[PDB]
Structures are given as C-alpha cells and as structure tokens.
Design a protein around this ligand. Structure first.
Ligand SMILES: O=c1cnn([C@@H]2O[C@H](COP(=O)(O)O)[C@@H](O)[C@H]2O)c(=O)[nH]1
Ligand SMILES: O=c1cnn([C@@H]2O[C@H](COP(=O)(O)O)[C@@H](O)[C@H]2O)c(=O)[nH]1
Lengths: 219, 218
C-alpha cells in the first residue's frame, strides 16, 4: 500500500493556483500525499498536477469520483493518469462494469483506483448508505485494494473496514470541518483526509502539526 | 431549453483539433453540444469558450457532479465560470448535494440536469432501484431538467411520468449503446448522440441520417 506520511492526506480544494501552492508548500514537511479534486483542476487545469509534482515530493490522488458509463470512465482515467496522477477515486454506485473499466485502465497504466463506498455528508443517508456494504463487497470481489469511507459515521467506517479486510487500504474524509475526529477515525482508516481545517487556517502548518500531535501515538 | 433538431452532440473526442473539426462538420444540424470530462481533462476548460466563439452553441457540461455539498458548489462555480450553460448532477448522493448545485446555477443564470437512471448495464445494480425516488426528489427540489436512459424506454417512460410533460428530459444511449432515436423521442425532448456521429466515417451524413429517421418528430 502507499506509504502515507503521518497518516495524513491534504485535501487541496483551494481554487487559486497561488494559494494552493503556498498552502501546500507550508505543510509539505508534514504530508507527502495530496488529494487534488475538481475545484482546483477545473480552475487551473490538469497541469496543476505537474506543478505539484515539480514543487513538492507528494503523491497525487485525483479525487474525480468517476461516475460515468464504462466507455467514458476509461477515457477519464486515461486522461487523468496521462497527467501524472498516482491514483483516482471512483464511485461504486454506477455498478461493477463502471468500476471495472477504471480498474482495467489503472492496471494497464500502472496506477491505482480508490473505490468510494459511503460518503460523509448528510445526503449520503438517502441512497448511498443503503448500498455501501454491497458496494464494498463488490469492490472486494473485483479485486479493489483501496477504499474511501466516512469519518463522520464511525460505526459505518468500522463495518466497511470489516468488509474490505485489514489488508485493504482505507482513507477517510470528513475530519475536522465535517465533524469527524482524527484519532477515532484512525482506529479504522489507514489515513485521514483533511481539507478546510488545514487550508483555511491562519497557519496551515500549525494546523497540520496540531492534528499530527493529537494522533502521535498512532504513528 | 430549445434544442435544434432534438439532437445534442456528445463531443467526447479528446483532441482539440478533431473535436472542433467534427463539431464544425455537423454544426448546421445542431445548436447544443454536450462536453464532458474526456475533452475537458485532455484540452482544458478553455475549450468551452472556444466552442462558444466558433459555434455559439449551448454547452452542457456533463460532469455528473457527485461530491459533498461544499465541493459541489465549487465544481459548479468553476464550470459556469468557464461558460457552460448547464451542468449534469448525480442524484444518488442525495438532496443536499443536488441543492448545492441548484444554488450556484440560480446565482449564475444556468441550469442543472439531474441524472436519474443511467443507460449502461451496471445501472441495474444500484441506480435503477433508486431512480424513481431520485426523480421524485428532483420534483420536490424544483428540478426542471432530467437525464434518463435511451436503452430502457420503459424506464424512460416512467421517468417522464414522474417528472411530467413540462419538465425537460434528455436521453443518452442512442446508437452505440443500442437505443433507437425515434423510440427515445417518444419520451425524451432530445436525444444525446456521441459515437454514432463522431466516430462515423462521415459525421455530417451520420447526423443527417439520424435527423431523417426522426423527421416526423420535428
Ligand atoms: O465522503 C466524502 C466527503 N468528502 N470528500 C472530499 O474530501 C474533502 C473533505 O474536505 P474537508 O476536510 O474540507 O471537509 C473534500 O475534497 C471532499 O470533496 C470525499 O471525497 N468523500
Ligand atoms: O447514462 C448515461 C450514458 N451515457 N452518458 C453520456 O452520454 C454520452 C453517450 O455517448 P455515446 O452516444 O457515444 O454512447 C457519453 O458522453 C456518456 O458519458 C450519460 O451521460 N449518461
């Protein structure tokens, strides 16, 4: 599995290149894994991945939540890996063919897929929560090794960990701004994803260091 | 939304020159182009403005927005800043995620298209069983524009029933995925067509042929 420094992944959702680079640079001593999503990519271009690689010693997870038909999913994954992303996130709710399309490209291209199981926001209760255990089981059957699950629902995160097994890699957003606790989340997740609690802080480095201090015995 | 010839081009070529050339070849037949991540992630969001400059066509950004509310808002803002007239949004992530998109669309004078049931085989696993409820959620939220599957006209018909005749419904899965243009237009206001046009030996003839086949419906 990827070796995530300090079990902490920065969710870099600032939408301005200068601010995104400044903040990421400020926390780089604490974090070697950065999640870049559509807020930044659609604002600054896919070349932002190249820029981050050039500036920082960071792996890049492209959080694109791929959710199209198999043929379009393949194209999205190809473009994303061509740009230099180490990994891409993929929704499971569109079904096994859509997931398989992404896995096939990732295999061919030597990169990784993260399967999104249950999401951390309130609306996830409406449809996703009821499908999530089956989505996770589907991932296991398809050979998915990397998963995303919700910090905001420890009971759900624990169940999802059970389903995927201890050998699978699990990362978890919803820590901080959405209400999730770093320590409790790391009982089940390999790494926590943190965005606003760091990138909106007056001192993002101090914010990151504070989170890390609070989980030091878990490192 | 008034779509010329009830036909929306799905421009999923991933090279700028080819995308512009092929769109140019079929421009007399359409005034609405769906641009998705295959083209945008290959050539950048500036491609949207370029299409508007060259063709004046309406642009639907088929981004299938599927994040938490806060991220959805940011995705919609970036997308509309680039000049998209509309954006597609998954309903599966729930009502708050959809509302986030509706808010930005209202603010910027744009439209949200709610994706109800998808057209590929995997849609049967989870989406199909939620789709009627997703459509009712759209109605509850005041959504006026919807996407449903050409490949299952009985499901497309049910979705039309739920949303009513006043709502606007577009439908992909025509041609390559097996759906029929005329049958789909029994229920949808417009059909989305990608590969059957953009992979054709002669895209203009392909478009003309589709339109010929539905001429009585225009
Ligand atoms: O279920 C979820 C919830 N959030 N996120 C993403 O993780 C980050 C959460 O950031 P935050 O710490 O500012 O809440 C954002 O990029 C959000 O899109 C997910 O991928 N899945
Ligand atoms: O349920 C679906 C099925 N397809 N599409 C999109 O519509 C287009 C279908 O193209 P095609 O005519 O080449 O199959 C592609 O861009 C695909 O991502 C959807 O939005 N929803």
């Amino acid at each position: 599995v990827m070796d995530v420094m300090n079990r902490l992944i920065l969710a870099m959702d600032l939408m301005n290149r200068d601010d995104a680079l400044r903040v990421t640079g400020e926390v780089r001593e604490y974090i070697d894994t950065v999640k870049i999503g559509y807020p930044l990519v659609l604002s600054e271009g896919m070349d932002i991945i190249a820029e981050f690689r050039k500036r920082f010693g960071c792996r890049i997870i492209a959080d694109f939540k791929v959710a199209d038909i198999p043929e379009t999913n393949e194209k999205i994954c190809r473009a994303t890996f061509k740009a230099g992303a180490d990994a891409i996130t993929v929704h499971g709710f569109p079904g096994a063919d859509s997931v398989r399309a992404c896995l096939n490209v990732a295999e061919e291209m030597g990169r990784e897929v993260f399967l999104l199981t249950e999401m951390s926001h309130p609306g996830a209760e409406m449809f996703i929560q009821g499908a999530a255990d089956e989505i996770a089981r589907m991932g296991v059957d398809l050979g998915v090794k990397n998963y995303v699950g919700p910090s905001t629902r420890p009971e759900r995160l624990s169940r999802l960990r059970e389903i995927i097994g201890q050998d699978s890699f699990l990362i978890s957003p919803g820590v901080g701004a959405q209400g999730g606790d770093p320590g409790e989340t790391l009982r089940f997740a390999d790494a926590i994803i943190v965005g606003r609690s760091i990138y909106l802080a007056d001192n993002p480095a101090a914010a990151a260091a504070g989170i890390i201090e609070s989980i030091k015995d878990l490192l």
